[PDB]
Amino acid sequence: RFLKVKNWETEVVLTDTLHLKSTLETGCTEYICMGSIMHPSATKDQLFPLAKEFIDQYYSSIKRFGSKAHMERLEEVNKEIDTTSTYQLKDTELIYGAKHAWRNASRCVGRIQWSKLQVFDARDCTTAHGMFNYICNHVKYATNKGNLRSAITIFPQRTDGKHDFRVWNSQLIRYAGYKQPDGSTLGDPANVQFTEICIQQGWKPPRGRFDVLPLLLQANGNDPELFQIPPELVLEVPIRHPKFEWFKDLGLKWYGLPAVSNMLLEIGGLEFSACPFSGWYMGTEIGVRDYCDNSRYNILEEVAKKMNLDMRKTSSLWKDQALVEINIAVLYSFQSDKVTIVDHHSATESFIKHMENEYRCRGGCPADWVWIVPPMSGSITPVFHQEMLNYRLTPSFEYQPDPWNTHVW
Amino acid sequence: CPRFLKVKNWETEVVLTDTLHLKSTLETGCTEYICMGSIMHPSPEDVATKDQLFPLAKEFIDQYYSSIKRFGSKAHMERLEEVNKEIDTTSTYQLKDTELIYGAKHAWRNASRCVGRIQWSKLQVFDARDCTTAHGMFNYICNHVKYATNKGNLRSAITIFPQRTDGKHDFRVWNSQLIRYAGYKQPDGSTLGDPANVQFTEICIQQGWKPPRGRFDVLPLLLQANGNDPELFQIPPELVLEVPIRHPKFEWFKDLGLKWYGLPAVSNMLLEIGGLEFSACPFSGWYMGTEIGVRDYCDNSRYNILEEVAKKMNLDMRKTSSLWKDQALVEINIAVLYSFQSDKVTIVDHHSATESFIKHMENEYRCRGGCPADWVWIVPPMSGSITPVFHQEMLNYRLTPSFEYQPDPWNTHVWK
Ligand code: HEM
Numbered sequence: 113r114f115l116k117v118k119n120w121e122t123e124v125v126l127t128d129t130l131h132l133k134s135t136l137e138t139g140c141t142e143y144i145c146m147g148s149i150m151h152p153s154a155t156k157d158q159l160f161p162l163a164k165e166f167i168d169q170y171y172s173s174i175k176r177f178g179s180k181a182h183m184e185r186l187e188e189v190n191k192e193i194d195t196t197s198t199y200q201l202k203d204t205e206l207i208y209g210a211k212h213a214w215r216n217a218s219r220c221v222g223r224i225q226w227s228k229l230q231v232f233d234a235r236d237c238t239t240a241h242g243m244f245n246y247i248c249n250h251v252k253y254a255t256n257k258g259n260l261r262s263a264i265t266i267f268p269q270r271t272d273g274k275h276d277f278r279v280w281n282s283q284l285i286r287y288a289g290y291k292q293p294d295g296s297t298l299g300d301p302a303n304v305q306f307t308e309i310c311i312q313q314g315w316k317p318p319r320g321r322f323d324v325l326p327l328l329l330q331a332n333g334n335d336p337e338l339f340q341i342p343p344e345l346v347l348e349v350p351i352r353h354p355k356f357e358w359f360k361d362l363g364l365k366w367y368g369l370p371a372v373s374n375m376l377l378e379i380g381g382l383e384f385s386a387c388p389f390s391g392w393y394m395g396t397e398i399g400v401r402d403y404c405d406n407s408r409y410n411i412l413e414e415v416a417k418k419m420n421l422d423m424r425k426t427s428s429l430w431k432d433q434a435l436v437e438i439n440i441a442v443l444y445s446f447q448s449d450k451v452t453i454v455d456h457h458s459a460t461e462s463f464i465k466h467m468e469n470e471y472r473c474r475g476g477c478p479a480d481w482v483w484i485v486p487p488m489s490g491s492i493t494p495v496f497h498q499e500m501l502n503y504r505l506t507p508s509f510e511y512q513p514d515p516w517n518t519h520v521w
Numbered sequence: 522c523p524r525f526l527k528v529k530n531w532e533t534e535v536v537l538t539d540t541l542h543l544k545s546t547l548e549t550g551c552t553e554y555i556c557m558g559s560i561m562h563p564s565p566e567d568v569a570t571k572d573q574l575f576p577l578a579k580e581f582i583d584q585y586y587s588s589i590k591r592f593g594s595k596a597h598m599e600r601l602e603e604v605n606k607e608i609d610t611t612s613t614y615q616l617k618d619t620e621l622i623y624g625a626k627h628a629w630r631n632a633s634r635c636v637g638r639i640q641w642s643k644l645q646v647f648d649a650r651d652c653t654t655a656h657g658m659f660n661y662i663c664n665h666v667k668y669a670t671n672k673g674n675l676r677s678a679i680t681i682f683p684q685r686t687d688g689k690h691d692f693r694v695w696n697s698q699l700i701r702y703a704g705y706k707q708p709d710g711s712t713l714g715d716p717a718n719v720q721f722t723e724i725c726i727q728q729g730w731k732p733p734r735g736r737f738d739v740l741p742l743l744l745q746a747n748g749n750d751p752e753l754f755q756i757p758p759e760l761v762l763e764v765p766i767r768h769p770k771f772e773w774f775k776d777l778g779l780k781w782y783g784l785p786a787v788s789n790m791l792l793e794i795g796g797l798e799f800s801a802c803p804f805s806g807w808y809m810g811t812e813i814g815v816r817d818y819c820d821n822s823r824y825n826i827l828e829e830v831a832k833k834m835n836l837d838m839r840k841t842s843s844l845w846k847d848q849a850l851v852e853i854n855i856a857v858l859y860s861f862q863s864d865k866v867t868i869v870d871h872h873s874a875t876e877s878f879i880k881h882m883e884n885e886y887r888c889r890g891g892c893p894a895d896w897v898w899i900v901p902p903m904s905g906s907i908t909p910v911f912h913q914e915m916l917n918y919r920l921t922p923s924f925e926y927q928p929d930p931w932n933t934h935v936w937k
Pocket residue numbers: 210214217219220221222223225229262263264389390391392393394397454459483509
């Protein structure tokens with residue numbers, strides 16, 4: 113049946129039909145909802161339907177469904193899956209595929225941009241060195257001197273499982289994390305393991321806070337190799353505060369380019385285990401999560417101290433005050449250095465606009481309320497009051513296991 | 522189906538194991554192909570049938586005697602055969618006082634959207650099943666409010682009116698809360714008071730209420746007994762504890778002229794125990810600050826004060842990226858907590874409350890094998906990720922006894 117979703121602030125009601133075309137499972141059941149579980153729940157005969165479905169979908173998009181080309185392209189794909197146990201996507205299909213994985217990303221508040229995506233075909237890559245080269249080109253293009261641009265670079269699809277391409281970094285640019293003799297942590301705690309894997313491999317670490325990690329690239333299922341990103345390609349922003357002159361002293365900085373490199377892109381039955389993609393930052397990702405999470409840089413106490421705040425009882429909301437200041441700083445800083453960034457008010461407004469567009473032109477838009485609502489000031493953004501349906505459309509970005517758990521050196 | 526289910530806390534890596542979900546009863550609205558976790562209510566005046574009723578009653582009795590370590594006892598079987606006969610000969614049955622108190626506490630304990638459940642076992646239950654008139658209802662309700670309020674040291678309580686019978690004799694509180702402020706739509710198009718209550722206010726005025734037409738007017742009680750038209754009663758003002766809102770630092774904050782009531786008491790939900798439906802069951806607890814400070818005060822379709830507070834804070838309001846809305850939000854929520862604490866009216870901040878719930882949830886997993894929670898509701902409307910629940914995986918499912926939603930009575934009521 114058609115489903116209706118309502119905004120409770122504006123009483124706008126949209127009708128969702130698109131959900132009827134999903135085929136992947138969500139993890140919920142009639143009796144249990146798992147909407148807050150982070151990660152819930154081929155062969156040639158498995159492959160051809162998955163393949164057929166995506167091609168039908170592709171030619172449907174270009175309004176040439178059932179055409180000569182379409183008939184023939186299907187013939188070509190089956191024949192290929194027989195004779196080669198797989199198949200290869202056309203360039204046009206590849207671009208269509210990557211843009212719609214973004215469009216189908218239920219957790220991404222930024223999807224108003226989904227069709228402005230630069231797609232870098234790297235399926236001819238054969239070595240970690242080749243990988244390093246394609247990645248430097250990606251970073252240079254995406255960073256673009258501060259005027260950031262959305263891109264993805266796509267390495268060869270998975271074959272037999274043992275000749276797999278993987279960027280071992282979770283992001284191309286991340287800060288190192290070191291575990292002190294103290295039991296304390298220097299830098300980013302999120303990356304303590306990975307930083308140790310790099311050190312074991314030969315990386316001589318600066319053992320400072322914000323040390324850019326090297327790349328760890330695995331090509332065709334071989335051991336990963338270390339590479340230094342040329343420092344001139346790594347754009348960073350020193351965080352300062354428009355009113356608090358002492359905020360300079362905290363010594364904080366973050367990188368400009370958010371580039372997830374550990375997810376898996378699935379198009380037409382094919383699995384791209386190496387497909388780093390990038391956009392630009394919503395301020396809260398840095399100012400709330402990276403800086404203020406307890407398992408991360410955890411700066412609230414330090415900042416609230418410098419603000420001379422009363423910190424003895426929780427009901428002074430001292431944590432809440434310090435939080436808004438830190439995020440004011442992040443936004444002020446990026447903006448001053450002409451580095452692209454977005455605040456959560458503007459981002460969430462844009463996503464509501466995006467939702468309207470998609471309900472109008474597509475009959476729905478999969479959305480994960482848990483992930484779309486910003487981690488601060490939730491109910492004073494429009495998405496808090498917006499009902500969303502979540503469901504799983506393909507092509508898509510999927511999670512995959514960490515490489516160090518599967519790889520035998 | 523899987524017997525065991527794991528949930529993880531991504532801040533502390535603590536993993537819990539849920540078995541209780543196996544006793545889930547009703548639909549969530551979600552399927553395997555779609556999740557409706559952010560839908561507010563995922564969806565005739567007729568009643569349960571004999572055959573529908575025994576298993577609902579049997580399930581609840583078994584559950585009750587298992588709770589008091591007397592499962593399989595002669596008392597258990599005597600209760601089963603007694604209830605069975607009552608149903609077979611009168612098409613319904615009556616709960617013992619002990620079963621009704623058990624049932625009520627457990628409906629709270631099962632409420633997946635409630636963050637305050639650590640208190641579930643301390644709940645004063647008022648049995649009002651002997652009530653027959655609206656005047657009687659008003660009397661029962663006044664005693665509830667007085668007891669719960671307790672001069673500011675609030676105590677949670679529920680008053681339970683007679684259960685449903687044929688569905689033409691329902692008892693209903695028409696108010697959505699026992700205590701709320703009126704909303705008045707101007708010809709201007711503007712709204713005086715609380716816009717959320719504009720419809721119910723128009724019903725009261727139509728029924729005969731003489732509105733003061735001010736910003737914070739306490740609404741009359743509109744009470745229906747035994748299927749009859751509802752009747753207006755004014756709550757004695759000395760029973761309505763209120764708190765003026767001031768700010769520890771900004772001396773001008775009082776000039777805003779804000780106040781809120783101390784006692785949150787919900788009166789439009791249906792309580793369901795062993796297949797019986799109590800359509801009138803007002804229950805009350807005490808506030809978490811964000812409820813007033815964020816939703817009541819700053820929601821755009823509510824009192825919507827963020828701009829005015831900003832202006833007096835002398836904040837740059839030309840760009841959203843100044844986060845002026847965010848700065849003012851926090852200060853508003855500070856004032857609210859400051860005011861209630863000063864007037865010694867019970868209230869809990871969102872940090873304490875969520876931390877307590879995490880503890881409650883863990884205990885529930887160990888002693889009960891689960892604790893249904895609704896993440897979308899449990900996480901507070903401001904400062905989400907800096908509270909522990911943000912990072913906590915939750916399973917949501919419906920256990921009975923339960924508090925449910927029900928249609929507004931004016932949409933249904935056949936007027937005598
Ligand atoms: C262009 C500006 C963009 C903005 C402002 C944006 C914003 C966001 C934010 C705030 C999140 C939540 C991240 C978190 O809290 O962990 C997210 C998630 C996500 N984004 Fe976007 N994004 C952008 C571009 C892109 C692009 C170019 C792609 C892919 C081509 C993409 C795909 C995704 C996916 C798959 C997730 C979910 C990640 C996960 O499940 O772990 N986004 N985005």
